[PDB]
Amino acid sequence: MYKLLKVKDVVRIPPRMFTMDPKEAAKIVLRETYEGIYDRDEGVVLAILDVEEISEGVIVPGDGATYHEAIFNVLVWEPRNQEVVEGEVVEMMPYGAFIRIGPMDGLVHISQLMDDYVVFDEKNRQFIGKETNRVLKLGDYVRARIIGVSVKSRVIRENKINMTMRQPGLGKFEWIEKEKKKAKEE
Amino acid sequence: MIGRKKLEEHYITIAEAKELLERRHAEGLAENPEEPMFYEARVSLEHAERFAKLKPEQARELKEKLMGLFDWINERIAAKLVDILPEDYLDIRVIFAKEEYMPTPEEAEEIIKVIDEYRPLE
């Protein structure tokens, strides 16, 4: 769920950057400020793309910085509830699988893999369904639906995404293709 | 909130985001601060490289066309439709299952046919 935001803000350009073109300078200050955070309303802040406009610089007594108002474009990404997503399995654990979807990972628990009885096979590091011999392993590609999101901190790592593949049209791509009109061979 | 006020927002495809992420990356080449992309942004870049199924320009065009096809296809749904590239009725079902309105078989085939162009061929 990528988004493009257009934002207006007030930037402080420090004295040490006075030889720099204002827009260039503002762009840097805005990157140091905003990139690398999870914004609770907007999501992962991936990039300050550019500065469209920058106002005339204002100077305040007691400070050699110049203050401007700027308008810029921001790339963000958000995990939305019930959103359909696609990704790669990047970690196997006994309780489930992390899927890259992809600036963050999404957890699919072992009970939310497939409409089957599923056990973890430690020897080969993979899930196998009892009746349907469907196998999920590291590096497999899937479609899933986000089922829960925990947005706590400004730090990405600490935020949590939970998903399912236990619905029609979800799962490993191989499963989905065999679910399809090979199961409408009517 | 980012900044003082949000003035405008758009839902964007993975393909469009791939282009922007590569731009950000190539800006570094930035010398004085270099300015590396933080870890998850680089991760996002990789994901987007793998999962952008269309070129940047055909993604946009398909997004616009899907939007002009029905009132119940807004910009978010069109961007999702482009990212996923649904092949049949089942794919359309899961995309719209949690949405406001559920496409009948026929309107589903209209979408699939529009998306049947643009499909990579390669």
Considering the segment(s) A1-81 as one domain, its CATH architecture is 2-Layer Sandwich (3.30)
Task: Compute the distance between CA of residue A125 and CA of residue A128 in angstroms, rounded to an integer.
Answer: 10
Note whether B117 and B82 are same-domain residues. Answer: yes
Of B2, B17, B97, the CB nearest to A42: B2
Of B24, B51, B90, the CB nearest to A49: B24
CATH number of B21's domain: 6.10.140.10
Are B41 and A35 a contacting pair at CB < 8 A?
Answer: yes
Q: Which residues of B touch A28 (CB under 8 A)?
A: 30, 32-33, 35
The answer to whether residues A79 and A106 touch, using CB atoms and an 8 Å cutoff, is yes
Note whether B112 and B72 are same-domain residues. Answer: yes
Q: What DSSP line would sit under A66-127, residue for residue?
A: EEEEEEEEEEEE---TT-EEEEEEEEEETTEEEEE-SSSEEEEEGGGS-SS-EEEETTTTEE
Note whether B36 and B65 are same-domain residues. Answer: no
Closest CA to A146 of A101, A81, A98, A77: A81
The answer to whether residues A8 and B3 touch, using CB atoms and an 8 Å cutoff, is yes
Q: What DSSP line would sit under B55-79, residue for residue?
A: -HHHHHHHHHHHHTT-TT--HHHHH
Of A32, A34, A87, the CB nearest to B2: A34
Note whether B67 and B95 are same-domain residues. Answer: yes
The answer to whether residues B24 and A30 touch, using CB atoms and an 8 Å cutoff, is no
Q: Which residues of A touch B38 (CB under 8 A)?
A: 35-36
User: How far B106 CA sits from the closest chain A CA (Å)?
Assistant: 17
Note whether B111 and B60 are same-domain residues. Answer: yes
Are B2 and A77 a contacting pair at CB < 8 A?
Answer: no
Are A47 and B98 a contacting pair at CB < 8 A?
Answer: no
Could you tell me if A13 lies within 8 Å of chain B, comparing CB atoms?
no
Closest CA to A117 of A135, A131, A134, A96: A131
Angle at A76 between CA A43 and CA A13, to 5 degrees: 105
Q: How far apart are the first and last CA of chain A?
A: 37
Closest CA to B12 of B64, B49, B47, B50: B64
Which amino acid is present at B100?
Answer: E
Task: Compute the distance between CA of residue A101 and CA of residue A93 in angstroms, rounded to an integer.
Answer: 18
The total of structural domains in chain B comes to 2
Phi, psi dihedrals of residue B42, rounded to the nearest 5°: -65, -35
Task: Compute the distance between CA of residue A120 and CA of residue A98 in angstroms, rounded to an integer.
Answer: 14
Task: Compute the distance between CA of residue B94 and CA of residue B59 in angstroms, rounded to an integer.
Answer: 21
Are B37 and A47 a contacting pair at CB < 8 A?
Answer: yes
Neighbours of B63 (CB within 10 A): 26
Domain that holds residue B122: 55-122
Q: What is the resolution of this structure in A?
A: 2.3
* Cross-strand partners of A6: A73, B8
Chain A segment 107-136 residues within 8 A of B by beta carbon are none
Are B84 and A9 a contacting pair at CB < 8 A?
Answer: no
Indicate the CATH number of A82-186 among 2.60.40.10, 3.40.250.10, 2.40.50.140, 2.40.50.100. 2.40.50.140
Task: Compute the distance between CA of residue A21 and CA of residue B22 in angstroms, rounded to an integer.
Answer: 23
Of A71, A102, A180, the CB nearest to B88: A180
Note whether B30 and B62 are same-domain residues. Answer: no
Domain ranges of chain A: 1-81, 82-186
The answer to whether residues A12 and A70 touch, using CB atoms and an 8 Å cutoff, is no
